[PDB]
Design a protein around this ligand. Structure first.
Ligand SMILES: *[C@@H]1O[C@H](CO)[C@@H](O[C@@H]2O[C@H](CO)[C@@H](O[C@@H]3O[C@H](CO[C@H]4O[C@H](CO)[C@@H](O)[C@H](O)[C@@H]4O)[C@@H](O)[C@H](O[C@H]4O[C@H](CO)[C@@H](O)[C@H](O)[C@@H]4O)[C@@H]3O)[C@H](O)[C@H]2NC(C)=O)[C@H](O)[C@H]1NC(C)=O
Ligand SMILES: *[C@@H]1O[C@H](CO)[C@@H](O[C@@H]2O[C@H](CO)[C@@H](O[C@@H]3O[C@H](CO[C@H]4O[C@H](CO)[C@@H](O)[C@H](O)[C@@H]4O)[C@@H](O)[C@H](O[C@H]4O[C@H](CO)[C@@H](O)[C@H](O)[C@@H]4O)[C@@H]3O)[C@H](O)[C@H]2NC(C)=O)[C@H](O)[C@H]1NC(C)=O
Ligand code: NA
Ligand code: NA
Ligand code: NA
Lengths: 667, 674
């Protein structure tokens, strides 16, 4: 739908990129990438990389040996990570497109496909020549990680059988051929297993968009890499960390509310953890590890891990006990809101915490080991051989209740810091002579709709079938949440011509007992929907803002084949070219109820720095230096806070149509 | 390599039996079984069965519906049990082989794969006309339970690529073409499946024959089936139960010994089970349930079952404390002969423990509940869909260490009762005018051997391919094995008599390097062999070859080789006479280069025949003597110094490589035993 135009030169480059996301598990020896790949000599091309040191390091490490082709790559393990990072450096410091391309061809040919794709996807994102380029949605690149094993197996069965043996029989199982695609209907995990109440939320926690979303978040801004590239953004890194989780968690909490599930559970490393996770997914070697209910974190195997983790926390508790201290070669003062940077970087243990370009093995990650122990897997066999859990991958992390429980813990500690900050005062927040006299919102209505994604990358083909470009294409379809578009009409009385910023937040109305929600202690349950600017004339004004224009969300990724068609028309998708790392639009609202679950909308209008000139979106945010999530980035005091340029509207989220996703999947 | 002749009527009937094990996971719309199934009108067939109540029962459950295809079937879940028992009764009461076969073709086509196989295997073993026919090995019928998921997966991929990407590359992943068929080399499991010392013995517990052996045990006498068929055996059923497990655990404890592992640990329902296991399997919907180390048995999900289990054992304690008590509508004394039988049936919750011809859904079973708690799965979704553990199948049970923990717990309880039995006196054991002067054994050597079987039944074929009854896909894995050896026995007799000669194998030392005393060692000996010799007065020497040992058998032949033998009017005679005994491969526990020390115990006593038992099992001594005599009960070790007894210290050596993996390395040629 929303597109953008592109010259034949961009087209050739884009198709070259996408060729690496096409048949990922296998090698076409006839194909151009293979000829290039097989014999390409990095050493002879040394002067075609910006950074000799990087390439040397790569050749060293590579001649030493990388991970093998049959294993499962995860970034959370040292040696694999380092291999990946070196490969990435290689892609990144390539002189030009051509060399980068030749470098990929090599790596595709010579290396573990998981490692390669991790590296490449990030390089494409992070390279400056490649800004403007497009990467396929992660569920197409790694489809095996966006579906339960039931479906995956059905796919393999159908392929072994070279088609359906009894079409009518297959239809009972949600399998049918549609033109030259085989289509699998896919149920969420709780259609087959309801082990605890968390399964109530599967349509969210398993939603291929939510998971892809987290995968983008990491890809844009990996914990091991410095934010150097982004210049000024670097000094805000910590801020972005906290914001991302605090937002995600708020959105998650909304889902919880509408399923009658309340606040996110706390755990202790010295105690068993009540909430299990039974992953219904596997790998060519092993199944993902399961965590039974009341799994005891404190066993022989974890004793040392727990020590480390306990210390990592106690250390931050000590920071909170002083207000000003020296850590990691910086001098920190918790009265300073800019210290959020340090705090965010502390918890993520990222490159910017130290002054470095990449993290080092001895700089041990709290998140890595939290994930590792929460994951409940047995100890890895060797460095390349471990039992995967959902927290070994960004594609799968959102699937485990424990994920939210972990980041909840971290975020909470970060707000323990936020308490140091002076609450915004009356006269910091006032917009003199402007008043929001009314807010009116359209119908807020959620629903489910079937969605298909191309899952072909999961299918293995034959020597003979590959040269024949024989087609066995696979689509997986499942109900995914969506909502109807809606308008927010804001009526404001500006005394005077002024330029304003309008901000829109969604928040809960009551807690799960009907206690109405007070800002004083519920400010962090506010989810930001929109940020925009408006000319405000004297007298009466009215802004109309449509949920499609909301800046914080994106449209669904277009499939590769569709992107591929658009390229022949000098076209490319807009949203995928620029706006990929945002939350998908359909998920903005939690699942409402047939009778209208109560939330509230917080509209806030405040003075914009004129510019004296015309305005464009991206730099317009950077010109006003308000902290992310303003004015709800720190504790509020209700009475000191409320003001005429604020408005709170009680709203109701309805749901229409079929309420349970499995009803779509009925034979 | 031994056979038995067979005529054309047999061959044709046999082939019919085997035809239903082809591509079990699918249907050949062109097969003969499919035409028979289509032609068979189940509602109009009341006249095919000798028991109309059983037919009516089936047709009733059938009118409401059975377990759908593609779900996992397990005998341990109530509704599925009723359905499977019902199907079995139809198989069993079919009046004729032609009626049996039509019914089997029907179920083959229209019923759940696992259910059908389950009942068909059993029916064949059980039916009068059909016994004496051969069955494919459990691992060739159910490859999915005998093949770890690394290989199973490689097989999926190979079939999807219709061969190999590039032949050299998958030589490196252990995949070979050999005679137009595929061979995948298979290793035993990591510590990511056995995450503790238990891994040391994966080569035993994952061993396909061992597992087959347990499945055959179940299938020969299902807990849910009364003993009516075996008449006077009914009296000895509980006694088998003890003997089977006692015996199996002995064999298992010997493996522990040579791997420095020591005594199978105790556990409690109120505490955590130390020793976890991650089954390398997945069903249609679910990966198998994992039990991590230090898994808490006592939690909300398991509370009510633990209450059940605890009282179940404690009431056995009350029965021991009283000695005479009215229980299960019998008045039972534990000094009685009938006691041993009772005890056994009590622990297994047999159909025999009650009134029952066929077990009532509502009679709660300690084994059933034990396996649910130790399996560590989430609670079943509905009653046709549960999350499988290794403890859900007899094919997979011997893989989970918790299995040996459970049954050792049972065996100890019965040994606790065995205090009530009267220890054998001196003249009781003393064979008058008969002495063993010497015993002599050949060198006892274990070693490893690759072994093949076709796993095609877990691989999927195209509409076209199925027409040929396709079976390309083989698993080659190193399995334990030993060289043949002979025992020679030197005897001096006053008189001509008939004697039974029994010889057992058991441990020599503690984990502390101390000699085991017999009072503590008797349960640790397993029977190798028994036979009857006419014994002449004067001095004689009896020789016995490991080849002729009563308790062990040759490997099964693949179904392909069975057919190739029928084509020339033969059958593999072990698959014929004795499919239900331990493979001879596993006769000796893995030795060492040192020689590992064990005792061979040789025992000669007077042969006093009784009318032949009609046997569900291992033909045992045609004696009024117990199973596993004279080790069927606690001993007084004085009474075991008799002249017709001989304890001989024996050392088991090993040859070639010490670990199975060294055999599945691409481009490494292993040290093979000679
Ligand atoms: C996503 O997940 C959902 C929920 O788990 C699955 O939905 C189930 O689908 C199965 C079919 O695969 C349904 O079970 C079958 O459907 C029929 C049930 O009929 C209902 O209504 C009749 C009255 O007409 C009642 O008698 C009955 O109580 C039911 O409520 C039956 O017609 C089916 O019978 C057929 O199969 C059986 C064996 O299963 C045979 O014995 C019969 O001859 C016959 O062929 C069967 O019972 C089940 O009802 C659904 N569950 C729910 C809650 O609705 C989806 O399948 C799944 N999607 C995917 C892709 O997996
Ligand atoms: C059953 O399990 C066993 C035990 O784990 C497996 O055995 C391992 O198998 C792999 C082969 O799959 C072995 O790996 C190979 O090692 C060879 C020996 O290398 C020595 O010399 C090299 C230099 O040549 C040194 O680097 C090394 O340190 C040793 O000193 C290598 O020659 C092989 O070369 C391959 O390397 C790369 C991958 O990095 C490939 O891309 C190349 O093309 C080439 O094939 C290879 O790395 C390993 O030694 C075995 N382990 C043990 C403990 O013995 C069995 O494979 C397994 N069987 C099955 C069916 O699963
Ligand atoms: Na928490
Ligand atoms: Na279950
Ligand atoms: Na054990």
């Amino acid at each position: 739908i929303k597109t953008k135009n592109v010259d034949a030169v961009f087209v050739e480059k884009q198709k070259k990129i996408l060729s690496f996301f096409q048949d990922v598990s296998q090698l076409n020896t006839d194909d151009e990438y293979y000829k290039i790949g097989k014999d390409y000599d990095i050493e002879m091309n040394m002067d075609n990389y910006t950074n000799k040191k990087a390439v040397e390091e790569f050749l060293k490490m590579y001649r030493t040996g990388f991970m093998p082709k049959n294993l499962e790559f995860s970034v959370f393990y040292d040696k694999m990570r380092d291999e990946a990072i070196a490969l990435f450096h290689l892609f990144y410091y390539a002189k030009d497109f051509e060399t980068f391309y030749k470098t990929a061809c090599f790596a595709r040919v010579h290396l573990n496909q998981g490692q390669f794709l991790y590296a490449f996807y990030i390089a494409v994102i992070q390279r400056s020549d490649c800004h403007g380029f497009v990467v396929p949605a992660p569920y197409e690149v790694y489809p095996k990680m966006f579906m339960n094993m039931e479906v995956l197996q059905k796919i393999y069965v159908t392929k072994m059988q070279d088609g359906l043996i009894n079409p009518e029989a297959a239809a009972k199982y949600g399998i049918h051929k549609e033109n030259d695609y085989f289509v699998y209907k896919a149920n969420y995990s709780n259609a087959v297993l309801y082990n605890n109440e968390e399964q109530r939320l599967t349509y969210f926690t398993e939603d291929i968009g939510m998971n892809a979303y987290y995968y983008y978040f990491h890809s844009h801004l990996p914990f091991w890499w410095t934010s150097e590239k982004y210049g000024a953004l670097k000094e805000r890194r910590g801020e972005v960390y906290f914001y991302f989780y605090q937002q995600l968690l708020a959105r998650y909490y909304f889902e919880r509310l509408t399923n009658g599930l309340g606040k996110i559970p706390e755990f202790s490393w010295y105690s068993p953890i009540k909430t299990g996770y039974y992953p219904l997914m596997l790998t060519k070697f092993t199944p993902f590890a399961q965590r039974p209910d009341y799994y005891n974190l404190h066993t022989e195997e974890n004793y040392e891990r727990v020590r480390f983790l306990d210390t990592y926390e106690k250390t931050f508790v000590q920071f909170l006990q002083k207000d000003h201290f020296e850590a990691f070669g910086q001098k920190i003062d918790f009265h300073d809101p800019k210290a959020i940077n340090f705090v965010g970087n502390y918890w993520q243990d990222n490159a910017d915490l130290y002054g470095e370009e990449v993290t080092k093995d001895y700089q041990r990650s709290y998140e890595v080991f939290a994930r590792r122990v929460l994951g409940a897997a047995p100890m890895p066999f060797d460095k390349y051989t471990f039992m995967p859990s959902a927290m070994d991958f960004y594609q799968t992390s959102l699937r485990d209740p424990a994920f939210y429980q972990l980041y909840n813990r971290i975020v909470e500690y970060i707000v323990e810091f936020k308490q140091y900050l002076k609450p915004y005062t009356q006269d910091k927040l006032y917009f003199d002579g402007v008043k929001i006299t009314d807010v009116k919102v359209d119908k807020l209505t959620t629903f489910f709709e079937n969605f298909e994604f191309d899952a072909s990358n999961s299918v293995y083909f034959s020597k003979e079938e590959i040269k024949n470009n024989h087609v066995h294409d696979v689509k997986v379809r499942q109900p995914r949440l969506n909502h109807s578009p809606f308008n927010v009409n804001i009526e404001v009385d500006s005394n005077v011509a002024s330029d304003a910023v309008v901000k829109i937040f969604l928040a809960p109305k009551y807690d799960d007992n009907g206690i109405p929600l007070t800002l004083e202690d519920n400010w962090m349950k506010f989810f930001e929907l929109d940020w925009f600017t408006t000319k405000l004339t004297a007298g009466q004004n009215k802004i109309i803002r449509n949920s499609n224009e909301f800046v914080i969300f994106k449209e669904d990724s277009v499939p590769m084949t569709e992107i591929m068609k658009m390229l022949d028309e000098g076209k490319v998708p807009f949203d995928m070219s620029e706006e990929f790392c945002y939350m998908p639009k359909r998920l903005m609202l939690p699942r409402g109820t047939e009778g209208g679950f109560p939330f509230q909308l917080f509209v806030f209008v405040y003075p914009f720095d004129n510019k004296g000139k015309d305005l464009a979106p991206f730099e317009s945010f950077v010109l006003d230096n308000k902290p992310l999530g303003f004015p709800l980035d720190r504790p509020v005091v209700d009475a000191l806070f409320k003001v005429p340029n604020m408005y709170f509207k009680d709203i109701f989220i309805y749901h229409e149509g079929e309420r349970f996703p499995y009803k779509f999947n009925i034979p | 390599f031994k056979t038995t002749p067979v005529d054309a009527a047999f061959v044709e009937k046999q082939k019919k039996i085997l035809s239903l094990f082809y591509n079990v996971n699918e249907i050949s719309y062109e097969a003969e079984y499919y035409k028979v199934a289509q032609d068979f009108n189940i509602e109009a067939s009341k006249d095919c069965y000798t028991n109309m109540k059983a037919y009516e029962n089936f047709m009733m459950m059938y009118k409401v519906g059975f377990l759908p295809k593609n779900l996992e079937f397990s005998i341990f879940y109530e509704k599925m049990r009723e359905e499977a028992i019902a199907l079995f009764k139809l198989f069993y009461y079919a009046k004729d082989f032609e009626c049996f076969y039509k019914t089997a073709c029907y179920a083959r086509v229209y019923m759940n794969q696992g259910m059908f196989l389950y009942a068909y295997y059993i029916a064949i073993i059980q039916r009068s006309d059909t016994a004496s026919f051969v069955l494919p090995a459990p691992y060739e019928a159910y490859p999915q339970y005998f093949v770890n998921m690394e290989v199973k997966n490689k097989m999926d991929y190979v079939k999807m690529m219709d061969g190999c990407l590039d032949e050299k590359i998958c030589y490196n992943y252990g995949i070979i073409k050999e005679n137009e068929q595929f061979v995948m080399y298979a290793n035993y499991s990591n510590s990511l499946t056995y995450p503790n010392n238990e891994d040391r013995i994966a080569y035993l517990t994952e061993d396909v024959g061992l597992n087959a052996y347990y499945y055959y045990f179940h299938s020969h006498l299902p807990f849910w089936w009364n003993s009516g068929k075996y008449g006077a055996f009914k009296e000895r059923r509980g006694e088998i139960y003890f003997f089977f497990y006692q015996q199996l655990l002995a064999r298992y404890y010997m493996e522990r010994l040579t791997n420095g592992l020591g005594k199978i640990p105790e556990f409690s329902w109120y505490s955590p089970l130390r020793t976890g296991y991650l089954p390398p399997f997945n069903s249609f919907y679910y990966p198998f349930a994992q039990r991590s180390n230090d898994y808490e048995l006592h939690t909300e999900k398991n509370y009510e079952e633990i209450r059940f289990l605890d009282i179940y054992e404690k009431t056995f304690f009350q029965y021991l404390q009283q000695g005479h008590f009215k229980a299960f509508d019998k008045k039972i004394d534990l000094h009685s002969s009938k006691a041993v039988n009772f005890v056994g049936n009590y622990w297994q919750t047999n159909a025999d423990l009650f009134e029952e011809d066929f077990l009532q859904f509502y009679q709660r079973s300690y084994e059933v509940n034990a396996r649910r708690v130790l399996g560590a799965a989430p609670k079943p979704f509905n009653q046709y869909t549960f999350i499988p553990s290794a403890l859900d199948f007899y094919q997979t049970s011997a893989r989970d260490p918790a299995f040996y923990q459970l049954y050792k717990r049972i065996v100890q309880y019965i040994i606790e009762f065995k205090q009530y039995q009267v220890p054998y006196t001196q003249e009781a054991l003393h064979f008058v005018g008969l002495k063993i002067s010497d015993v002599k054994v050949d060198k006892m050597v274990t070693f490893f051997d690759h072994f093949d079987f076709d796993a095609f039944n877990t691989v999927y074929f195209s509409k076209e391919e199925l027409k040929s009854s396709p079976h390309g896909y083989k698993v080659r894995q190193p399995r334990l094995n030993h060289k043949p050896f002979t025992v020679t026995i030197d005897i001096k007799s006053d008189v001509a008599t008939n004697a039974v000669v029994k010889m057992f194998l058991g441990p020599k030392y503690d984990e502390n390097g101390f000699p085991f005393s017999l009072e503590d060692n008797w349960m640790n000996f397993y029977e190798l062999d028994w036979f009857v010799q006419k014994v002449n007065p004067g001095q004689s020497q009896i020789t016995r070859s490991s080849t002729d040992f009563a308790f062990f058998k040759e490997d099964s032949l693949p179904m392909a080789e069975i057919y190739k033998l029928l084509d020339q009017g033969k059958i593999p005679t072990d698959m014929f006479n004795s499919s239900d005994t331990m493979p001879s491969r596993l006769m000796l526990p893995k030795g060492t280069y040192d020689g590992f020390p064990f005792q061979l115990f040789v025992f000669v006593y007077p042969y006093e025949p009784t009318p032949k038992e009609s046997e569900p099992f291992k033909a045992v001594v045609p004696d009024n003597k117990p199973f596993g005599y004279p080790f069927d009960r606690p001993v007084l070790p004085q009474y075991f110094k008799q002249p017709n007894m001989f304890f001989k210290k024996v050392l088991v050596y090993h040859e070639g490589e010490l670990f199975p993996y060294l055999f599945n390395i691409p481009h490494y040629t292993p040290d093979k035993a000679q």
